[PDB]
Symmetry: C3
Subunit: 317 residues, 3 copies
């Protein structure tokens, strides 16, 4: 009689369909998903330092809009900007806004140091009803609106050396009055011109008098500029009117900081990978949640699912 | 005696040489080409909506050059710009020309709506011998050259609200006269200044009087600018001279539209993939016709040919 | 008794560890390194034409700084800029500096042709103590500082046609005086304005009078601009003061030329691939020396080492 000895392999009743080089649909005993397609819906507050902008854009927190005083000197790994954020100060624009936003986001700090600028012969600390704190007329916290003193505005020619070991970021502005009579009532002369320079750079800006549409009841504008001053260099401000003066400088650092637009709530939890949709697990190599990511994240791909076989071909009985 | 039974495989007299991981030249029984290397030489007019610019650049058709009146309100999937195209109106430049061209190309429409701007106290509809229609002096169809009325040009301070559900694109310009006497004869005052603003943006432009080389016998210039006005925002134009005024707005859409430089003829045929060389079949995954493509196109690669084996190794008798 | 016949394969005592799809560490009999991780430390002077900038930036050699007279009309495949390089002429800036540097680097030539500009009614060849040659006051070699003649500066309205078969690059500038009295003592009128145009382009620049920090004892500045003039086009310079005039044009070529920042010494040797660290062998497909490369170079990758098996699995006795 003898015996029979059969060689074989396992199978399962419930196999999984995968793709190969030669077949778009072949059943294997087991597979694992390589694309992360879901988020928790919230941004975990750990392990990255998250700063929720709430009502404030980064630039409003920089300039010191009345709703953003809580942000002074704060640092972040990720600044989260909300779609509802709105400005509540004097109407302004920033030529190159995207660049200033980027460079501050990347620096990751609003650390500010006051400096004693000698604004000889002018009135300091100008305020406006378009920028209230506690119903008092106010202004951007980090800027100094200079105006005439006893109907004179003598030329400014003011220096601030950088004797630090680090770079300084200066934010400053030019005021564009609505009319020629406004120009005279504020600055006591028919126009201005502002030149801000260092040993290696120069910027001159001309105020442009005229009407813009009313925003928070103001038809004038402020235009915001910035200047970086290296160790051993010197800031020189030379102006005859219309200067929205710096009060000091911001520290500028380098590191891993960034900014993200999201309306996702911040939660008490721990996740390395942040998207605008919320944090996502990062076990998988790929994800199709969002191209926008921050941290140790799977790579964004177009596919919904990619199944990696983890077993043999399934050949059921 | 018994029998002999031989196992074997086919071969062909005429095999094809392919590349593998271990051999740059191995003969197989059959192969297929994966790189499309030829075009028909013409651009098929289907299934994309093709607009042949003929003598007109997109920007000339936008502004309304005399040779481009046939283009009014036309739409396209692909605007085809010809190398022979030339301007036949007042000499102009567009700071950022590439961006205006891109944004209009991408929008895919020249749909224009006239609006009633109140140009109180000036002469409208200025014309020039450098921009003829039917030998009559004329001007860009979408722009309004304003000049003095009875040797006065009172300040303009004109508003146009956007109460639509869509964005409006405004095209406007500044006239740079050749001389101080030209400035006075056109605008009745020594210079101009133009500020165009919205609630969220502002542009001011200064005319610059002086000689440029003659183009179509004109040594002055026009510089072209644009402004996008969102729903609920308001256009404000404030100027004292030198304004080349808008007559209305263009619709701005988003979609699949673009622009291509080509001298290929347009034919009555159907092809999904367009290159400057002409339409190409899109059965193959790769092509080496042109990096510039539009539609469902193979991907551009450097290789002339890539042969995919579709049979076994060929081992002839 | 009979015989025994055993089939087998070789092995070595000293195998090499490689990575595969299924194992990060498997021993093979032999392998070869695919990542170049070392340089010689010097830049080989062959086979590319190397131009060592020594104390000169490319832009200083272009303008004709006193330390850069040896560079006149030189050509390069690779211009090497040293970190110690410094300027020793009148303090200047170049709006778009990076672009002018790039376009000259890419052109690969400082070939300069003088032209006879008719500067009727002004003093030519102005010099300064901030730009010495042999202790004599001097100026940038390729620029012409125009000033008043007998306390007059009549308007300039000067033409230079391009009747060549090639494009011309013109470099020119605007002088920004420190004070209103300086403006008058140099140019005999209260301000300037410079318009440089062609048939297809226009640039106007306004001088901006004021103090900048002293650099080589000068608080004024020069701002440098450029203009390309095509065959058949015409350069037109129209100015009333503050013009730092061109003396001629540079040739502009296209080809394989570039620029690199490096402090590596130049040696007498032959290597196709240049990095800032020095030349590297290019036998391997990859390298981790520097992302910055010039010539026939391996591709930059993050890995230190990638070992390609060149033998079987090593199974020692
Ligand atoms: C089909 O094939 C897949 C892939 O091989 C198998 O999935 C693995 O299953 C094993 C055994 O259950 C898993 O091992 C466990 O992993 C946990 C950590 O999870 C990591 O990866 C997952 C991915 O989903 C993430 O959730 C997470 O962030 C981690 O990165 C460990 O915590 C587990 O530990 C447990 O056992 C150990 C034994 O020492 C103890 O220390 C602990 O007490 C603990 O209880 C465990 O190691 C493995 O993660 C799975 N891999 C993947 C990729 O999912 C399936 O099991 C297989 N299915 C079938 C039916 O055969
Ligand atoms: C060497 O190997 C290649 C690849 O396997 C073989 O090429 C295939 O040959 C078959 C049979 O001739 C082709 O099948 C036919 O395809 C036509 C559609 O063409 C598509 O792909 C080509 C690519 O060149 C494009 O021109 C075109 O845009 C399409 O995307 C069909 O129209 C044909 O239909 C005919 O038969 C069917 C049968 O039902 C009928 O419905 C119709 O009446 C009609 O007459 C047909 O299906 C196939 O396209 C080829 N593939 C490729 C990639 O070229 C070679 O045959 C082989 N050579 C040898 C000697 O063995
Ligand atoms: C482990 O596996 C590797 C890869 O197979 C083997 O390395 C090869 O070894 C052979 C024989 O020594 C080498 O052949 C020689 O190449 C020289 C040119 O070098 C090129 O590549 C190297 C890469 O390091 C560069 O240095 C160089 O820039 C070149 O691009 C030739 O000059 C040699 O010529 C000599 O022999 C010929 C015979 O005709 C004569 O003409 C000359 O007189 C001359 O003396 C020779 O051809 C080959 O380059 C190596 N390849 C690589 C990638 O390194 C190892 O040998 C093997 N190790 C073991 C223990 O088996
Ligand atoms: C130049 O044109 C602009 C735009 O048309 C004019 O601005 C408008 O000025 C009026 C009058 O001051 C403003 O009216 C005010 O509206 C507020 C808000 O409702 C109200 O509280 C005030 O009592 C007053 O009615 C109007 O808001 C403003 N419009 C815009 C769009 O800014 C400007 O007056 C013109 N200048 C001249 C000199 O004519
Ligand atoms: C750059 O800073 C300097 C230094 O303050 C400014 O120059 C100074 O400007 C003032 C006011 O414009 C000048 O005073 C005026 O002089 C005229 C001439 O007699 C007189 O009529 C006026 O009543 C007034 O006194 C002053 O002379 C001048 N100083 C120098 C050294 O030139 C300059 O304005 C600043 N630039 C900018 C853009 O702000
Ligand atoms: C400032 O310089 C420019 C450039 O040299 C001068 O422009 C030139 O002006 C002359 C005289 O009007 C133009 O001549 C005309 O040429 C046309 C075409 O052949 C002809 O039909 C007319 O009868 C006349 O001869 C010339 O085209 C023009 N050149 C350029 C390059 O634009 C300008 O006159 C100078 N301004 C002053 C105030 O000197
Ligand atoms: C922005 O729009 C406003 C409103 O039209 C413009 O302001 C107005 O400009 C005119 C002409 O410059 C001023 O009239 C002039 O007043 C002087 C002073 O007495 C007089 O000598 C002249 O004969 C003439 O009548 C008008 O007062 C002024 N209105 C206001 C409210 O300031 C302004 O020019 C526009 N800006 C631009 C850049 O166009
Ligand atoms: C406007 O402000 C600037 C910046 O504070 C003033 O520039 C400074 O001017 C002084 C006086 O000319 C310069 O002093 C000189 O220093 C050199 C080098 O040590 C020395 O050789 C001279 O004998 C003299 O002491 C100083 O360098 C310069 N500072 C800077 C940073 O540029 C300018 O004077 C002010 N203008 C007015 C009208 O007040
Ligand atoms: C562009 O080039 C033209 C041609 O040279 C310049 O125009 C000319 O400018 C001069 C000086 O500004 C004018 O002469 C002046 O005329 C007035 C008016 O009577 C007189 O008071 C002065 O004493 C002087 O003679 C000349 O008339 C004028 N020519 C023309 C045809 O307008 C213009 O300045 C140049 N533009 C630039 C930005 O440099
Ligand atoms: C995460 O957020 C993104 C961005 O909003 C979502 O992608 C959008 O999905 C909508 C449909 O819900 C589409 O209309 C848009 O085209 C998508 N936007 C972009 C920018 O691609 C995405 O669905 C979200 N994913 C998850 C898993 O929540
Ligand atoms: C399609 O058009 C392109 C662009 O003109 C052709 O590519 C050029 O070919 C010429 C030689 O005829 C070269 O001198 C240029 O360097 C190429 N230009 C570019 C931008 O790469 C191409 O040959 C055409 N292809 C076909 C199949 O017609
Ligand atoms: C070649 O030069 C590069 C650039 O300086 C070197 O890369 C730097 O290495 C230092 C450490 O020595 C790091 O701190 C920097 O982050 C690196 N710089 C950049 C820009 O990546 C590199 O080490 C040199 N390689 C060799 C083989 O000499
Ligand atoms: C943000 O603004 C809204 C009103 O727009 C207000 O209800 C809310 O209290 C503000 N949040 C903070 C944190 O100030
Ligand atoms: C301006 O305000 C600050 C407080 O913000 C104060 O320290 C300073 O004395 C004020 N200066 C003047 C001139 O009013
Ligand atoms: C285009 O211009 C040429 C002359 O340059 C003319 O022959 C042709 O008729 C024009 N085409 C159209 C469509 O107007
Ligand atoms: C300007 O021209 C248009 C026709 O293009 C006409 O409707 C309008 O009445 C003209 N306006 C004036 C003020 O001449
Ligand atoms: C470069 O400058 C240094 C001083 O800064 C000098 O020692 C050296 O001789 C200069 N080199 C050349 C080539 O002129
Ligand atoms: C300017 O200098 C050059 C030499 O660099 C000389 O040829 C020319 O004659 C000088 N011109 C004047 C007007 O001084």
């Amino acid at each position: 009689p003898g015996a029979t000895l059969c060689l074989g392999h396992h199978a399962v009743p419930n196999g999984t369909i995968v793709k190969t080089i030669t077949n778009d649909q072949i059943e294997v005993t087991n597979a694992t998903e390589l694309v992360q397609s879901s988020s928790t819906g919230g941004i975990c507050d750990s392990p990255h330092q998250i700063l929720d902008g709430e009502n404030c854009t980064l630039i409003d927190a920089l300039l010191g809009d009345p709703q953003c005083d809580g942000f002074q000197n704060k640092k972040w790994d990720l600044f989260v900007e909300r779609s509802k954020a709105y400005s509540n100060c004097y109407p302004y624009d920033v030529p190159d806004y995207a660049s200033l936003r980027s460079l501050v986001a990347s620096s990751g700090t609003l650390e500010f140091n006051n400096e004693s600028f000698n604004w000889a012969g002018v009135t300091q600390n100008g305020t406006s009803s378009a920028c209230k704190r506690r119903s008092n007329k106010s202004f951007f916290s980090r800027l100094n609106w200079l105006t005439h003193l006893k109907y004179k505005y003598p030329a400014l020619n003011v220096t601030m050396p950088n004797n630090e070991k680090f770079d300084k970021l200066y934010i400053w502005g030019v005021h564009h009055p609505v009319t020629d009579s406004d120009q005279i009532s504020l600055y006591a002369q028919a126009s201005g011109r502002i030149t801000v320079s260092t040993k290696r750079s120069q910027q001159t800006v001309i105020p442009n008098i005229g009407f813009r549409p009313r925003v928070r009841d103001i038809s004038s504008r402020i235009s915001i500029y910035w200047t970086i001053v290296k160790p051993g260099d010197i800031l020189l401000i030379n102006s005859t009117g219309n200067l929205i003066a710096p009060r000091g400088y911001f520290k500028i650092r380098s590191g891993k900081s960034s900014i993200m637009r999201s309306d996702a709530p911040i939660g008490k939890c721990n996740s390395e990978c942040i998207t605008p949709n919320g944090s996502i697990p990062n076990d998988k190599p790929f994800q199709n949640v969002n191209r926008i990511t921050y941290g140790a994240c799977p790579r964004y791909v177009k596919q919904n699912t990619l199944k990696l076989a983890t077993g043999m071909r399934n050949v059921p009985e």
